[PDB]
Symmetry: C2
Subunit: 253 residues, 2 copies
């Protein structure tokens, strides 16, 4: 009979592929996880979240999408202009700023600005940290297209080519967003990988957008969770407690 604390400790040390006294169970698992880190150190040394970003960056750059790197610390006023009055989830910084809860506002600004320079259609994407209070720190991909070719079919076609590239099975279900309105949810079982939008929407006017557009947002930690069969998404996050899904706390309980 294991205590709750003993069971939690073993669960942290347990890996999806893994298949008696507590101390002996812990020692066995600690041995396996140390060896796992040893092999990563000897043979690959890349972080899953960083590696996935790099693989996704390649996919969209190859497909003709411009790689964007925009501020993570953004004006609070951007949130207001997204119609977010959900406000409790916003991490406030200084007085007039916040940690971005989504990539959409910065990308809206880039779409409007790049429309003065780039031919039709304009295709851009960004990968990076986003924040939502009470995962609080996670990594989003947003891609979007503006101009011609901005149809439901094309949006679904891009999403399909992308998840086929990652080798992730999915389905699409109609849903809504209190920000974007009607959406397409990309589902893996009951886990939402993505929300996608077929523009235009009334919100566009507040951002100087006057062309049709399509876009989709993906959580990278959720993609890792599906790909590596993590039970707990915290295994896929920026962390001091997990590295590539392996516990970094290899002390004894």
């Amino acid at each position: 009979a294991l205590t709750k604390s003993q069971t939690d400790r073993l669960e942290v040390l347990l890996n999806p592929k893994d298949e008696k006294p507590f101390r002996e169970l812990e020692s066995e698992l600690l041995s396996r996880r140390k060896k796992d880190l040893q092999q990563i150190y000897a043979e690959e040394r890349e972080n899953y979240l960083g590696k996935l970003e790099r693989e996704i960056t390649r996919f969209f750059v190859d497909r003709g999408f411009l790689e964007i790197k925009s501020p993570i610390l953004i004006p609070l006023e951007y949130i207001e202009r997204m119609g977010i009055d959900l406000s409790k989830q916003i991490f406030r910084v200084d007085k007039n700023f916040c940690l971005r809860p989504m990539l959409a506002p910065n990308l809206a600004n880039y779409l409007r600005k790049l429309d003065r320079a780039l031919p039709d259609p304009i295709k851009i994407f960004e990968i990076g940290p986003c924040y939502r209070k009470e995962l609080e720190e996670f990594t989003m991909l947003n891609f979007c297209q503006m101009g011609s070719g901005c149809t439901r079919e094309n949006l679904e076609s891009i999403i399909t080519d992308f998840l086929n590239h990652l080798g992730i099975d999915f389905k699409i279900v109609g849903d809504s967003c209190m920000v974007f309105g009607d959406t397409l949810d990309v589902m893996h079982g009951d886990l939402e990988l993505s929300s996608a939008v077929v523009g235009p929407i009334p919100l566009d006017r507040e951002w100087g957008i006057d062309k049709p557009w399509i876009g989709a947002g993906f959580g990278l930690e959720r993609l890792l969770k599906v790909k590596h069969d993590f039970k707990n998404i915290k295994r896929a996050a920026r962390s001091e407690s997990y590295y590539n899904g392996i516990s970094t706390n290899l002390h004894h309980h």
Copy 2:
């Protein structure tokens, strides 16, 4: 005779390699910058800051350093334990957190934890956003080694191989840090690219470190500034105003 506002506007549109009425000067420059973006869109589509991260990641992974991705939002208490009582530069979040002003605390924790698993020497690095109030948002590389081989010579040898790889000329000058104590400053002219430290230091005890160590921190925006000959480092930052050093405001003044 150009007004101050007219001169600022042209400076924003001017590129390092570039070499009469304002409106005609502005039109010429707007034409050149649009063409620049057009070529980037047609031919490479990678963001300089993202591309540099990827090139540096490859360098250190190839050299045997473990790639780390740790939280950007960190406990305020970490700052206190770094001896930072400079406190005005800290962006506070929620009540007990802040945006990390440096990568050192998270990497200290990783060094201590990984020492239970990895053979000697332990070599790790991280690239990512850091924050300092009043650039406020910038990108740092930190690499460090712990165990054997943690000598001044080796640290300087790594720094040299790294900047030779990037093709950046430099010199090293003795300096100090109110956090780390005596340091080695990596200088490009009067521009500090990096501060490096030959451990151990008394601060180590507060982080559970008991082995010799060496480390160095580099600002990626400063590396881009040198590499691309930017006069203004804001051209190298996460921004809505510049993309790969090119102004995104291609409206008319």
